[PDB]
Design a protein around this ligand. Structure first.
Ligand SMILES: COC(=O)c1ccc(O)cc1
Ligand SMILES: COC(=O)c1ccc(O)cc1
Ligand SMILES: [Zn+2]
Length: 299
């Protein structure tokens, strides 16, 4: 069978929140079968756990925020993207503060830290959500859709009228049967506009933002001296965000996601609409990895 996976070993990292600018200690720990991804605020007494599930998304302003009452875990999407990309089902994510560290603004440092620790196959079938029928949500010119697909595929389109986007790839499709999450998507970074930073800081957004953890765009050029990792880095980052947002379903998808200018808010609304529309999906297992429509790297 395709087995559930957890971490082989505890691993530790230090960084700062993108939004809060606060220093944070991150610990990834192994978790038993059917735990899912559970975030833990270890700075609080008593400690507060928040499962990484669509129903715990409380705020979606410029990141996905998990919330239990007054307790928040902000910017979970880049770490959940890495976990979805490596096939991690079960893990405890301990944090010393209210926001996952931004690291280099991508999933690259997370995929490296996890593959460094190693993955552990567990003695239980991995459960997938197979999309059986179209489910779509719209708001204004934004759209997010699931359609049936025998595999996992993401298509995304952004539309920015900014000189730095003129004639640039604003649309991409990744089929994870053809393409490596790791080589193709994980290194795409968070991006931001100089003309926005005053408004954002006034909203307690991007307080930790800099060229060290983001592509900073200024009028006609990228400020980062060493430039882009990909010609289409911006749309690749939105695909990274979508994978992270969609992993709040709590299981890997067998289907296709298409986003048109979709962000954290509409991605979460798509998950809530799917969960409610029970005839559009089923839980499936594969008793032979070799005959299944998606494969994961050796652990
Ligand atoms: C100047 O703007 C920034 O530094 C910045 C960093 C990260 C963002 O997400 C947005 C803006
Ligand atoms: C939410 O993302 C996934 O379901 C997923 C499934 C297979 C992958 O290879 C990557 C992501
Ligand atoms: Zn992001």
């Amino acid at each position: 069978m395709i087995k559930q996976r957890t971490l082989k070993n505890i691993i530790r990292a230090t960084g700062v929140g993108l939004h809060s600018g606060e220093k944070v200690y991150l610990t990834l720990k192994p978790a038993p079968v059917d735990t899912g991804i559970v975030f833990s605020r270890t700075d609080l007494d008593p400690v507060v756990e928040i499962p990484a599930r669509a129903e715990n998304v409380g705020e979606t302003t410029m990141s996905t925020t998990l919330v239990k009452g007054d307790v928040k875990v902000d910017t979970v999407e880049h770490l959940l993207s890495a976990m979805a990309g490596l096939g991690i089902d079960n893990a405890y994510v301990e944090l010393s503060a209210s926001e996952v560290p931004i690291m280099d603004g991508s999933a690259g440092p997370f995929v490296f830290l996890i593959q460094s620790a190693g993955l552990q196959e567990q003695e239980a079938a991995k459960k997938f959500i197979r999309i059986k029928r179209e489910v779509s949500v719209e708001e204004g010119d934004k759209r997010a859709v699931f359609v049936p697909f025998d595999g996992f595929k993401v298509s995304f389109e952004i539309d920015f009228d900014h000189p730095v986007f003129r004639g640039r790839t604003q649309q991409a499709s990744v089929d994870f049967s053809s393409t490596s999450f790791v080589k193709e998507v994980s290194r795409a970074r968070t991006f931001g506009f100089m003309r926005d930073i005053e408004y954002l800081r006034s909203q307690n957004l991007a307080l930790g933002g800099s060229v060290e953890n983001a592509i900073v765009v200024d009028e006609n050029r990228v400020l980062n001296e060493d430039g882009l990792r990909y010609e289409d880095e911006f749309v690749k980052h939105k695909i990274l965000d979508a994978i992270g947002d969609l992993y709040l379903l709590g299981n890997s998808l067998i289907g296709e996601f298409r986003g048109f200018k979709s962000g954290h808010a509409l991605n979460n609304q798509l998950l809530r609409t799917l969960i409610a529309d029970k005839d559009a999906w089923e839980v499936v297992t594969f008793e032979d990895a070799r005959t299944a429509p998606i494969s994961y790297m050796r652990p």
